[PDB]
Amino acid sequence: ERVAKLAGGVAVIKVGAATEVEMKEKKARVEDALHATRAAVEEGVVAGGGVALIRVASKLADLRGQNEDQNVGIKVALRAMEAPLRQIVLNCGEEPSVVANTVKGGDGNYGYNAATEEYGNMIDMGILDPTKVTRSALQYAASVAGLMITTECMVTDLP
Amino acid sequence: ERVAKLAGGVAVIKVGAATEVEMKEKKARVEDALHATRAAVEEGVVAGGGVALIRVASKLADLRGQNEDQNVGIKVALRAMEAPLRQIVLNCGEEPSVVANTVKGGDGNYGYNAATEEYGNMIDMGILDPTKVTRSALQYAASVAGLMITTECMVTDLP
């Protein structure tokens, strides 16, 4: 904060809306974007639409572990890596597996543009997620769900 | 017509079988088939796997009615025409929308062979439904469900 006061400078974004329920959801989105850009800057961008994830899943098609159970454990994460793309499509009322099949038929930054309903190069269409966020999504989900599946017993209060 | 009936004799069939159950059971299926056949003859075969229906749905992609409600009414039947294929696939434990997407990507008699789990030409693979049956399925379902959706009030006995 002090470095900006001295350096460079300090900027304020003022959000406009007609009402107050609008003000709140809008201010919340600008706050969200403000963070996501700060993350991209410290950690770049990758193809959005969750294609980045689908792309790393095919790169790791040949990853193996110390034994067969570890292998299924890998295939479990890879298969999960498809889910963001799969939900995005499902929220559009469209066939999620059919979109996924055809994105997985492509290469590099080829993806589905859910807004316009046609395939293309995601970076060219301006659909970029920041790397830090995609990474962070993955690391954290993995961390919790990893633990979660090792649960054999649960202890809680009575109803 | 009187000559044809008379000169002419009557052909008979004796359904052979191991068990009296199967026997009389098989006998049944026979009389059935015979039916459809006579009918099939009077008015043939079409690609099974419910592809015929999926095929007519794309031919009618440009059908319209007297007003917008009539239009939705058309899209409602077309969308339904996909259901047999969709159930067949769902009974195999496989992704029904993914199969449908790829059959709809094809043409003519290209379909899914649920038995062998691979796509191909349905007539070549011997998967044929008789026309009279496919037609008749459609006409009757339409007839009842058509009426059914116009229901605003129901009158029955007390529980």
Side-chain angles (χ1 to χ4, degrees), chain A residues 37-88:
Chain A
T37 53
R38 286 237 192 84
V41 164
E42 72 182 80
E43 239 179 278
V45 309
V46 298
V51 20
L53 253 38
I54 246 124
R55 262 349 146 195
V56 335
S58 41
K59 300 202 168 248
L60 311 176
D62 287 337
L63 207 53
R64 300 261 177 313
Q66 303 168 264
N67 74 292
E68 191 43 58
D69 288 345
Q70 291 198 7
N71 288 349
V72 173
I74 291 153
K75 262 40 194 166
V76 153
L78 305 180
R79 218 159 338 139
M81 259 165 254
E82 282 183 43
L85 189 239
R86 271 141 162 307
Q87 250 316 308
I88 287 170

Side-chain angles (χ1 to χ4, degrees), chain A residues 95, chain B residues 53-54 57 77-87 100 104:
Chain A
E95 327 246 37
Chain B
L53 253 38
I54 246 124
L78 305 180
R79 218 159 338 139
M81 259 165 254
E82 282 183 43
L85 189 239
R86 271 141 162 308
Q87 250 316 308
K104 289 188 315 185

Side-chain angles (χ1 to χ4, degrees), chain A residues 10-16 23 26-35 37-38:
Chain A
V10 143
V12 181
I13 284 173
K14 291 175 177 191
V15 197
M23 186 62 82
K26 185 98 152 286
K27 197 185 106 217
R29 263 174 318 109
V30 186
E31 278 272 23
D32 251 56
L34 211 273
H35 278 61
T37 53
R38 286 237 192 84

Side-chain angles (χ1 to χ4, degrees), chain A residues 86 95-99 101, chain B residues 86 95 97-98 101-102 104:
Chain A
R86 271 141 162 307
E95 327 246 37
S97 37
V98 163
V99 164
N101 274 5
Chain B
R86 271 141 162 308
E95 327 246 37
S97 37
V98 163
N101 274 4
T102 87
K104 289 188 315 185

Side-chain angles (χ1 to χ4, degrees), chain B residues 21-64:
Chain B
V21 178
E22 167 189 359
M23 194 295 80
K24 297 178 296 182
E25 188 295 298
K26 182 176 182 179
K27 177 184 176 182
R29 290 152 42 191
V30 182
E31 300 165 300
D32 296 353
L34 187 164
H35 269 302
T37 305
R38 289 189 160 294
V41 177
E42 311 186 5
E43 310 188 11
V45 309
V46 298
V51 20
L53 253 38
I54 246 124
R55 262 349 146 195
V56 336
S58 41
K59 300 202 168 248
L60 311 176
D62 287 338
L63 207 53
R64 300 261 177 313

Side-chain angles (χ1 to χ4, degrees), chain A residues 142-154:
Chain A
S143 182
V144 221
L147 273 173
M148 212 135 327
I149 46 145
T150 61
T151 279
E152 181 68 13
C153 178
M154 288 176 112

Side-chain angles (χ1 to χ4, degrees), chain B residues 146-155:
Chain B
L147 273 173
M148 212 135 327
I149 46 145
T150 62
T151 279
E152 181 68 13
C153 178
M154 288 176 112
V155 171

